[PDB]
């Protein structure tokens, strides 16, 4: 099973640090943004230290990398035309960076209507994707299932299907399924994950599911809040999350944790990934996981 987490793509080491971080958590896959997750400021390809990173990955059993576009990209914006056009330009460049890094999937929050309404937002996202995609690219944009917080589009499978249907080179589109987002959007992944996966297959198609984000949620089903929670400490729970991670239909899909760092105070936060990955591999919930992370225990 391919299980990992988001890791930082930063500093002078860039991809090498990302791989070192992933290996330190016992991950065999990882997800990175191509720079700061909250902005479009980026380094050149040469500065990404890709060959050092890939050599380290090979030496540590890391077989697949996923890339995520900055969360500020908004090709659903119909109000600020610079936001839209800059998003389009950035994504074209991001696909080239992703191809250079050797990842096949570039995760993208579809877009947000920011007040123009879902219908308008969906039309705009289709326009943006049609301006971005080339027939030659060897990367797929994995549209992420969203929680529906704010003005997010992509809260339902039908919204994603509508976008996909409007894109010419839609063979370049895939989907990233996030457990916190789908639960928050209203899908019953706690009691009927198979039903949600079947609904996904019927509306979008499992052939397009290329990345999984494994997160518990701080809120009830349908809350539309998007506040991730450590594995088994939220409203989704260990049993459901573990079931998804080991699902017979999702064996070849990378599973990426994006759970919150652990710590009572803001100035002392530690990654939970090593412990969460081991817990999921053991298939046994550990009620003292947060205690252990907040002390350095195993
Ligand atoms: C798009 As996210 C990092 O809230 O799963
Ligand atoms: Fe995301
Ligand atoms: Fe996510
Ligand atoms: Zn989220």
UniProtKB/Swiss-Prot annotation:
Check the record and name the PANTHER family matching this protein. Answer: APURINIC-APYRIMIDINIC ENDONUCLEASE (PTHR21445:SF0), ENDONUCLEASE IV ENDODEOXYRIBONUCLEASE IV (PTHR21445)
Identify the enzyme class. hydrolase
| Sites where the protein binds Zn(2+) 1 | 68, 109, 144
Its source organism is: Geobacillus kaustophilus (strain HTA426)
Tell me yes or no: is DNA repair among this UniProt entry's keywords: yes
* Described purpose of this protein according to its UniProt entry: Endonuclease IV plays a role in DNA repair. It cleaves phosphodiester bonds at apurinic or apyrimidinic (AP) sites, generating a 3'-hydroxyl group and a 5'-terminal sugar phosphate.
Q: Mind listing the GO biological process terms from this record?
A: base-excision repair
Cofactor dependency = Zn(2+)
Q: What is this protein called?
A: Probable endonuclease 4
Which Enzyme Commission number(s) are listed?
3.1.21.2
Indicate which residues the UniProt annotation says bind Zn(2+) 3: 181, 226, 228
GO function term, MF aspect, one: phosphoric diester hydrolase activity
